RNA sequence: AAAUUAUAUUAUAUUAUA
RNA sequence: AAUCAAAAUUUAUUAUUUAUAUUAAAUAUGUAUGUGUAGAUAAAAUA
């Protein structure tokens, strides 16, 4: 129900997310190359997954800002190491960086703007000005982007009594203008062929400063890697889905809802296929079989199983994953299933075939552990102040 | 049972009567802040009238509250609706 | 020289619109209140320092760099459904000059109805995007809108189509289809051959029509023959379990407790699918956040459980009070055929003093004796000194924050 | 009476197990 | 900051050098213990579970003589790395492992199996020949 | 009684020693009032606290760079990101559900 | 006069212990489970 | 709805914010 | 049953904490309740 909701919820949310940012971080380290446009969350109760692969692949676009300082911000995908360049960046100009010349230009470009906007006569006298025209316009996309982080919400401009541009109201050319930024490879000419003869050149450390201290680039490599486009979320309970879209509509805008998942759901593609703490909570009467199956059919990239560490999940995970790596044989061998984490054998686990493990509860799960720091309610039903809250989790990417 | 609507009754019965007493021989200060504090204490009132409705005090106030927004010249309002409606009851 | 002109469809020239609900009632509603009497004395003051300064006149009685000028008088309304644009054209009209409306609609059909409203007059008064109503407040944050209004339910344009389902009468096998926009997953088909018959009665019974001796009959109709491939199989089983449709369809006058089982279940169906129960709660709640000081809030209600919920609302809300509540006037019934029991809830934000307003009217006894238990046993306790809690405060900076906005 | 409370929770199945 | 753009490349260079060694390294099951030497048990990649232990001090397979200090070889041969290390964490398979121990294994799964099991009983299931 | 009711100018912490009704709200109107009043977060100074990789570079440029491929290798296998800290939205989402209903 | 039946249950909610009760029921929930196998055999 | 198992006593706590 | 210096173990540096004491403005409106940690132990009936 919702009250059941509320309370597995304010009970399980820092440990889930804790278990969640556990395997996204060994995710981001494993496959740096990875950005998954399509998630698919199945059993999606509360979107804790959902917000955390949004923490992990698009820290720019959230409505509050990161805690920067954590370990658990530095990933390895390139949206999060775009974003983490920004702020190194930011902190290069602060801190390692004694001149006063930047808020030189700084200023002076304030009051130059600010004169010349009611005060001195026009810019055609002074020859070659683009440069601060240029850099003026960029920095008032930034204002706008200081806009949507100050109020923690988008579409913040039209909210103020600033006039509204006349000319496309709904958005449309807007969505329909062809990008000339997207150029595949047949449509390239008008060039010399000296440039494309010569191969191997940008490897000197210099011109990968000249890469790295450029920002045009750096707009123009996020547009075309766009982190998050089409969210489906599956859940069947309603108390599970209306606290779930009470926390994922702040942050992750336009997420589907799906109520069940069908046995012709298979035919649509997803990138990402996350399944958190959900394969334990299939019933009995269900298949979780032709579940476990249906979910990895639907995968173009990664199928990320997260679970409590128990026994009985353990057996289910174990069994799941047994069931997944039988269909290695079955075809093409660009699409046959590898587990990247943890199990790097892909054979038969041998904690789960240990001779120890007979009369010794404790060795017979291959597991995990996440640190989180607790919260209130945490202390108030455990009877212990924890300052540091430990969640084991098994996990199977 | 307090009665703040009671206090809102009779200040639009003031007003209206400050607007009666406005019958001099042109007064445009009068009837412009007159018809400003009626208009505001009006949308103060809309919600108290809806609170208050069937009650022991507003049908005792319900002519007088009719008399005055009529004299104030404005009709097709919420408030004169709800009026008409109390009113036609009334008679019936 | 040739054009490429697409080929259309059998809905799109076929295609119609919802007729317009109330236009007078509203406008008094959705603009009328104390946003518009400051907005029309304001207007009243810059005309008479145009004559002032020196500017052109007739004989009558009386942020940063580039967004220097800002906007003037204008009175900003937010439409959460905009629908065939009626209600939003009527702001717009009546409303002449110094008004705006931004509306937000689930379906992508709902951009013809926007179209037809920019070409009239666009791109500084009307605004149009593509979202539910409960994610108005992530988009546009608190105290951004001098008034917002909320419609509910089917347009008269997805009533009718053959793809958009709710067709009751047209004798021929379509998918049941049946919701608002692409945000919602399953429709009716895919819901009923994979619910379970202990969630549907739980959906049900969640919007008080068909209660649970009358849910658990439809309910045990449903599951035990449940091969549905068309829609014409799964009317056959919804009316052979109780009464047969009313002859109006989806729009019956008669009484709600005397409908019939095949009209409460069909109408619950589509409150299960689009989430009218969440949607209304949350965009309701989030609309007294949008809201400035002493705004309006206009809500229609069609439906026995909607009036429910916004009384439940209007209550509990520490700025929310009923300015009136009007019904449908007997006109609008017979020459555009809506329901008989629409109303319209006209609710005001009150800047401060909201539960003083309520306490007059329901203050019991009973509710005084539990007022001293709970200021004795202190249950109105909150937290502050837990892990998220401490990073918590009111909408108002303190003289911390202040110093953190300067360098930030 | 707290595990009588999710006996309306229960699956119509498994409600009379005994 | 020219030093500190620099060193992100060379530490991008790094990484991308041993990521290529990463799926030939083993994985940290058991949370290890430390007593001066610190012994933890790992997945290997060829299915197996072993028991290894890792010392500070440098012992080649030949002869003791080197051209690293202390630090050097505990920052080397992943003491400072497996002692910070707990269970779920990838160790190199390049670092010497000392005193390796396989562990015994059995045709069907230990996991769920009941401890209610009388002495013998147990005895013969672990040892794969069971009643 | 006294103490029933809250008057709006005393704090709620305190008590007021007015006996009168009017003009005043009960606790439980109180306690959904300030559920209610209490959605913000506190401004976090993105100036105080440095980025974890300004300070992982600034611990890499002060090694050895002979030692630095080890130290890669040391930061690679630690698949711990350490003490979870709650994002601020999820700290959000947290006490927006929190805010929904009495603590009772 | 006692107490109304819900401010004493939100009472009992409020003020009592938490650890005790989730300790408690966990133990009941296992009791009932034990219960429910000896009765599958 | 009784018998009382109940310990009970008083004080403190957090990046106010450095 | 085949080994070896964690905190066997001592000492120091921009740096990581929890504690140590320092440590202040602010009535324009609205306002801010924990689990525990502790010392010797000398009241008792809504289930
Ligand atoms: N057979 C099934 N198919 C789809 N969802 C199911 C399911 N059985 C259970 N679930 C859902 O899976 C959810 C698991 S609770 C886990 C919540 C979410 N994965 C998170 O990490 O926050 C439950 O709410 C339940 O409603
Ligand atoms: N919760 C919601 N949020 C935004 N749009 C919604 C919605 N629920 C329904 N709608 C849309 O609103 C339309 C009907 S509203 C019906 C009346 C219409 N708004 C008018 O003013 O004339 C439907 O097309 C539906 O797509
Ligand atoms: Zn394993």
Redesign the pocket.
Known sequence: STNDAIGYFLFRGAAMYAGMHRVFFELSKQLPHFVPKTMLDFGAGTGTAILVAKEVYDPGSLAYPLYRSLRQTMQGNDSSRTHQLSELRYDLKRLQRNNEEKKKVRFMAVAALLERGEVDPADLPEDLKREIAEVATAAATAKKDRLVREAHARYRDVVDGTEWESGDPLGEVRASTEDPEDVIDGEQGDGGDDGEAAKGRPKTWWEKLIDVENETARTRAARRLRPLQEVTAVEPSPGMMEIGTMVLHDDVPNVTWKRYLLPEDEAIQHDLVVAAYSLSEIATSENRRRIVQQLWKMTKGVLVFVEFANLNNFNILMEARDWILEEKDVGLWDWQPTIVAPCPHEHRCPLRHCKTGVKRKRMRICSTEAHYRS??VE??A????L?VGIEPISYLI | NPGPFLDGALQLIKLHLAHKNAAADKNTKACSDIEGEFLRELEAFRACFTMSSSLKVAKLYTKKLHGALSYFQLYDDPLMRQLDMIIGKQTM | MKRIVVPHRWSEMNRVEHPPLMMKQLFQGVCGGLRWLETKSLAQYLAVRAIEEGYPSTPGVRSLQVTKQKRLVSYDVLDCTLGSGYHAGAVLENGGPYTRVVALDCDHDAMHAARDLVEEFGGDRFRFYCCKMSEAKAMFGERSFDAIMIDGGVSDTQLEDPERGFLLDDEGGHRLDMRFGPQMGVGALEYLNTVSQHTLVSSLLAYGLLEYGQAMKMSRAITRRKPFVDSREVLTCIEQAGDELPEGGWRSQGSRRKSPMSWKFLTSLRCIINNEMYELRQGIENALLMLRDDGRLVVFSRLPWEERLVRGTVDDHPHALLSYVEDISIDDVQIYGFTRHAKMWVITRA??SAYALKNTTTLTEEKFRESSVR?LT??????????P??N?????F???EWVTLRRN | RWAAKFYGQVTFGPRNYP | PAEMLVVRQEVEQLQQRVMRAAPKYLRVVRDPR????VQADFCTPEGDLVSG?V???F?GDRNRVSAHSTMRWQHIGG?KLL?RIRRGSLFPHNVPL??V?KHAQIDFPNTLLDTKHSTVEQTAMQYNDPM | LEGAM?????????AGSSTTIAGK?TWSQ?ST??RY??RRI?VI?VA?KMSYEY?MLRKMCKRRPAMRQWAVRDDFCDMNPGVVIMSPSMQAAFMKVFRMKEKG | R??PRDV?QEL?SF?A???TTLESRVKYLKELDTMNQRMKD
Do not use: I
């Not at chain 3, 202190?378 to 892990?387: D, E, K």
């Not at chain 5, 430390?34 to 030497?37: E, L, N, P, R």
């Not at chain 6, 809250?6 to 305190?14: R, V």
């Open positions: 919260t209130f202390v108030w455990r009877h212990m102040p300052k | 800047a401060s200021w202190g249950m109105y306790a909150g937290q502050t000194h837990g892990f809690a401490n918590f405060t009111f909408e108002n303190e003289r911390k | 430390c007593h001066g030497k232990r010392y500070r001090r012992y003491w002692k000392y005193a121990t | 809250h008057k709006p100018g005393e704090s709620g912490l305190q709200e109180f009032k300030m009043g209490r506190r100074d105080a300070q | 006692e107490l004493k009992q003020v212990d938490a650890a």
